[PDB]
Design a binder for these strands. Structure first.
Ligand SMILES: [Cl-]
Lengths: 76, 77
DNA sequence: CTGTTAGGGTTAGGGTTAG
DNA sequence: TCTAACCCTAACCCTAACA
């Protein structure tokens, strides 16, 4: 975990939250869908997405999981 | 004041460890803390809870140090 | 028997607060 | 002002409860 830390861009979070309200438990395929969705919003024309910037299904997973946890905790 | 303040000697000690490893575990942090206290400890005087060094404080400092460094890096870039 | 993952933890980067 | 303590949460580990 000592590597530089990834940041979710405001535009990705929108897609995320959109998909999150619909359903908070995306399956693998769904996560891939959301991943491509997010990438499509951030990729700059004419440039490939760096491996550090590209959203993967796993990032999406962890995001959902973490959010669920934060909510459950923030409900006392 | 009424907030914890790092004594120079303590900082020196901690820095000596920071240059070797920047992520000391609990046990190591105990060692470091005890080292610090030993130095700032005066005879026949119990160190007040505030000025007393603990593994948690060491932890906080190490983290803050790493972060300060990462800032200093971006400043020069 | 093989394979997934919820949700209980922890570690640590980038930033903000509080005294 | 100065910075120790804290906040948030990305990214992982672990085991029970499944399919
Ligand atoms: Cl931290």
């Amino acid at each position: 975990r000592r590597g530089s830390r990834f940041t979710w861009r405001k535009e990705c979070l929108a897609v995320m939250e959109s998909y999150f309200n619909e359903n908070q438990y995306p399956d693998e395929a769904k996560r891939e869908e959301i991943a491509n969705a997010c990438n499509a919003v951030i990729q700059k024309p004419g440039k490939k997405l760096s491996d550090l910037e590209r959203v993967t299904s796993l990032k999406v997973y962890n995001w959902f999981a973490n959010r669920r946890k934060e909510i459950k905790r923030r409900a006392n």
